[PDB]
Amino acid sequence: PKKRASNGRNKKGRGHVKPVRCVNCSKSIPKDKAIKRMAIRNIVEAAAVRDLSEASVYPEYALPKTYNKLHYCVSCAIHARIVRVRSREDRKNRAPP
Amino acid sequence: SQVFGVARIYASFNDTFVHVTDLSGKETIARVTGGMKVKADRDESSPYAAMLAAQDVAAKCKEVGITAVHVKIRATGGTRTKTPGPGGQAALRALARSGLRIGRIEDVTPVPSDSTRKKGGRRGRRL
Amino acid sequence: GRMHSAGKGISSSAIPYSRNAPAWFKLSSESVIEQIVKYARKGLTPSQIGVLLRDAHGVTQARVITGNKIMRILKSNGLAPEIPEDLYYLIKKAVSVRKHLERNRKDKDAKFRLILIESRIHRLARYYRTVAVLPPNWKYESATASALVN
Amino acid sequence: GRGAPLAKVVFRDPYKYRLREEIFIANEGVHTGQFIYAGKKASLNVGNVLPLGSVPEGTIVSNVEEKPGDRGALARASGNYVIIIGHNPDENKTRVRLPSGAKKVISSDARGVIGVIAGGGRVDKPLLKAGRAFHKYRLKRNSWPKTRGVAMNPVDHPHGGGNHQHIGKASTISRGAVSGQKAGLIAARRTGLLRGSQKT
Amino acid sequence: SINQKLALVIKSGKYTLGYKSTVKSLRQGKSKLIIIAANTPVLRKSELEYYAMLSKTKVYYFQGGNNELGTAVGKLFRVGVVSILEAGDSDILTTL
Amino acid sequence: MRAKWRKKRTRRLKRKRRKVRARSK
Amino acid sequence: AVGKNKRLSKGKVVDPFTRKEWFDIKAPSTFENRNVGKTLVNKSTGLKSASDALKGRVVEVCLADLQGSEDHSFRKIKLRVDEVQGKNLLTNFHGMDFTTDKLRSMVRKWQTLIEANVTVKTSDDYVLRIFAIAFTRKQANQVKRHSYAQSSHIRAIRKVISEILTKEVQGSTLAQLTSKLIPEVINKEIENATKDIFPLQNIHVRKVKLLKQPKFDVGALMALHG
Amino acid sequence: AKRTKKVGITGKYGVRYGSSLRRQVKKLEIQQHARYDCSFCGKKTVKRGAAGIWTCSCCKKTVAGGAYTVSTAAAATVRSTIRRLREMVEA
RNA sequence: GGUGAAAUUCUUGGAUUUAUUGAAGACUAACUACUGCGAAAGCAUUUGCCAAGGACGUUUUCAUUAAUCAAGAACGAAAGUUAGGGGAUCGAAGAUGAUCAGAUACCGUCGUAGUCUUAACCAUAAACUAUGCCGACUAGGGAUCGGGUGGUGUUUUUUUAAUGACCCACUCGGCACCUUACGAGAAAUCAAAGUCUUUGGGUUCUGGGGGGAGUAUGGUCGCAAGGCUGAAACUUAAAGGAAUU
């Protein structure tokens, strides 16, 4: 039967959505169906912070960060534990943790 | 004061390049990778290999006379992983420990604006 | 509605209840009639005649101020067009679309819309031919339509 | 005998009161009454004869000189052209790509006409007829029809003879072979139908 | 907008089409604007420019050939140059 | 058997029948 | 990997650093910090002419490093060597670029990104492509979550931005453009000209690249201009 | 108003040479015998004289073009790239 | 370089890596959303041109011109066919290295056709919302997109009309969503899948146990691949749906 009212994606009023490639397996998956997550990370791994700061030329350097958007196919997201299988009643929870 | 070069770290998977050029990027000094520091193919991008490479690069650049590095991180980019490998952080930490001064960290991973075509096929890497 | 689209829009004129209206109009039926005639001679379809009358003059509806509607005035006074204005405008739109298509052969959307517009033209023409305001054996042809417009 | 049209261009003699008629290989888009400009200072327009050093990278050129002054050697057949790949200003040498895909290094002073050669797409039409082939070659040269060597006798060809029509020995012939031996596939690196591309 | 202004002057004002009529009107000093097709011969365009410089008229250069100018005027043939003798109701002379 | 592969097999059978019939006629 | 090369020399060392030597890089006068760094080069032998082997090279420098101000940390400047005077080589403008960090930090969703680019030439025949970035912002007191532009505001904004960029380039030489770009007055100009259409925050001029430059330009004026 | 279903101008070749070769010849023969616009005078008077020669019968102008078309796609693309390079050079 | 590890491959004729350029072709990241448009297929770089369109507003016009539709038509992803161009990337076939009992598979490196385009064909998709179209009515709620209306409600010209962008209250029309069961349903679930044993608003199409079989045959369309139409003999007691432990 119909597992989800949304068919496991986000497409109402479109028909077609251009695909993206999974960042792990490079599988084509419609952009609305992907498990895109925005990863914003410090460059210095939060463990070399003091070492880099004390070895820097400038005092109170800003320490820029890196941004990327990771697009995930359903298989790769489940395997990498980006998402997990939930119970039937709380699959409907749209709210992020 | 400090003599400035560019660290030019390439943290891919299965390898990590660390090599300081001059400020213009044309004069290459101390090109050392993890594969020349480790034996097994699987460890070429290990953090230990990246660190050994960074220590060697720091030694050679200090011998040359360069005292500070503008650090430029880069993953494979293009249609590839675009996430820095396990050795970039090890390399920069090792440089900082080696004590060459650092300034202006940046990430220069080539990011496509509508790339050509990712490899692996439509169904991906079925492993 | 929207015989040729999926739109379900309700948007029209809320005609006032009163027929003997509007208690602020001091002009005369004859004055409005000769305004109708002057605009028609100037060369205006009943749609825009009624628009400018309601819009620059105070004319709530020519139907309620006079005893009859603008097309009736024009037909009684000899100013009725050779073809009705709605069919004329449909033919003008079809001519414009066909002229566009001749240059843009690749415009499949324009081809589809031309099909729709010409279907509307043929339906309107069939109605007009049945009610006999258009002569029998009148038929819309793409070749002669541009000359028919002007 | 030529698939490309020729253009007769009249120039003024700079040293005497004379008119000089030059015979050019017509580039596609050239018309009668058109002004052609030839020289170092000529502008990048179809039909002009700028040097390679004066044209930029990616330029389409035709009737290109192999050495400066030879009056046109490369890219002269209909539809063919030369791509300008690069420049080496030190000992001025323009790198170009030839119609066969070969990379060549020519002097930067070698002339060339901008554009492609007219008459392109000629070989897209099937001849359909030994008659059309006959009329084609009747004013090129006596090279048609072509009898197969296997259909001759052994006196007439290396392939001739036998009780069946067969070559007998490998049809790939050495480059060091001699006249009378060089009949077949001369110095062939490989044979057979290859699935491939321009690879250039 | 120029095509719409040309249609408006065609409907309301006075125009004449063709090189001979245009040159004759330029000679008489009655022409108020001349539109010249993009593909008109350069010698003819130069002569029309010279005539218009002598007679102090305005020259507009159509972004289209004689076919396009004929369609813009509203004729089913080709016109190389059209001289507006009076706009009538258009603003073609006033605007650029 | 997957329905798509059964469909392909039936297409192959159909074209083989067509070829044999055209040979006989 | 250290000992797995099967064939590294098909056929069957002097130290480059002692072979080389050091030069000194000087930015134009439009920046506060004249000296920007050093570079290596092979000593000029009789057949190499180190001057010409080094003349056509560019250096990326942070505008914060050039100006001694930490507020320029997200800008970059390309300096192209054009002359050499005995270990005092002088550079000129090539292009301003942003930082990848700055771009990705300014780009967030639930808002509209607007991009424009213009290819207008300067007064002294420098041809540049200037890229302007803009972002719609939420007004204070707004309860709506996104604050998007209506794609006609977008076209009006792009037109206004392009007009500002074209007018500001045509009317100023390259030195004037750099002198008016370090204080990013053009950002304020665009912001004022666009505030009547949409709030439009984060209006920093993105990269400008030098597509082509005029002739040698080597004799009598960058004493005053660098 | 059509005497042949699909052979068109290649009905002169009868049943010979094969359908595919006759189809290719049909395409190129329609192009080669067609009449083209003259960019100079604006009339459909441009004909092929020989392979490459395209002569307008009204303005008496000869043009160098394709073997079977007044202009080939390669020629148009080359003209576009040459224009782009010229404007990059000039400005 | 690549992998779970490897190997195929390149590499002192300097490979990978660095910087500056150049070319080609493809694509249009982030912005990008339970957001927009289109009849669907689909459509995401900027400007210009060309026509078109829904919704809203109208105290404008005609006046039943309308709804659904055998026959007959237009468009119709991808792959595919024919012929030019193009041919970067990826890559049915194929090559090749692994893995394996085997492995002409997954994994790896190449790589023709193809992927792009022009002209002409094809006419299929889990072409899906597996939900025909038109109309009326039946619960609550918030959010959102387009239009409109009313609020000396907030930012600067002008802290002293305008406009804009927001904030409130409605309103019409969309893509949807949350809650509940008046109801419906085999249930999953559904604001329609309701107003249907208290059975009738109008209309088109389709199905009648599972296979054989979308086969055979005839027809027709197509260059072909195939598309549309389309059985029977024979065989069989279950196939199947939704839920429960």
| Termini Cα gap of chain D | 30 Å
The greatest interface here is: D-H, 37 and 35 residues
How many H/I helical runs of chain D?
Answer: 1
Number of helices of chain H: 2
* Strand line-up of the largest beta sheet of chain H: 1-2-3-4
SSE order of chain H, as H and E? HEEEEH
Radius of gyration of chain D: 22 Å
Write up this protein.
This is part of a larger assembly, with 8 protein chains of 8 kinds. Chain C is mainly α. In chain C, 58% of the residues lie in helices and 0% in strands. Chain C contains 7 helices and no strands. Chain C is elongated. Chain E is α+β, with helices and mostly antiparallel strands. With 226 residues, chain G is an alpha+beta fold. Chain G contains 7 helices and 8 strands, in the order αββαβαββαββαααβ. In chain G, helix 5 (153-169) packs antiparallel against helix 7 (185-194). Chain G starts with 15 loop residues before the first helix and ends in a 14-residue tail after the last strand. Chains in contact: A-B, A-G, B-G, D-H, E-H, G-H. Chains D and H meet through loops of D and helix 1, strand 4 and helix 2 of H. Chain C binds one RNA strand of 245 nucleotides through helix 2, helix 5 and helix 6. Chain E: One of its GO terms (molecular function) is RNA binding.
Q: Which features does this protein show?
A:
part of a larger assembly, 8 chains, B: 127 residues, 2 helices, 6 strands, 26% strand, E: 96 residues, 4 helices, 4 strands, 44% helix, RNA-binding, pre-mRNA 5'-splice site binding (chain E), ribonucleoprotein (chain E), ribosomal protein (chain E), cytoplasm (chain E)
Question: What's the helix and strand layout?
Answer:
The structure is cut from a larger assembly and holds 8 protein chains of 8 kinds.
Chain A (H helix, E strand, L loop, with lengths): L18 E3 L6 E3 L6 E6 L6 H7 L9 E6 L3 H6 L18
Antiparallel strand pairs in A: 1-2, 3-4
Chain F lengths: L2 H22 L1
Chain G lengths: L15 H4 E7 L8 E8 L7 H6 L2 E5 H5 L7 E9 L5 E10 L1 H7 L6 E6 L8 E9 L17 H17 L4 H8 L3 H10 L10 E8 L14
Parallel strand pairs in G: 1-5
Antiparallel strand pairs in G: 1-2, 3-4, 4-5, 5-8, 6-7, 7-8
Helix pairs in contact in G: 5-7
The structure holds one RNA strand of 245 nucleotides.
PDB class: ribosome
Keywords: 80S ribosome, ribosome
Entry title: 80S ribosome with A/P-P/E tRNA and mRNA of WNV
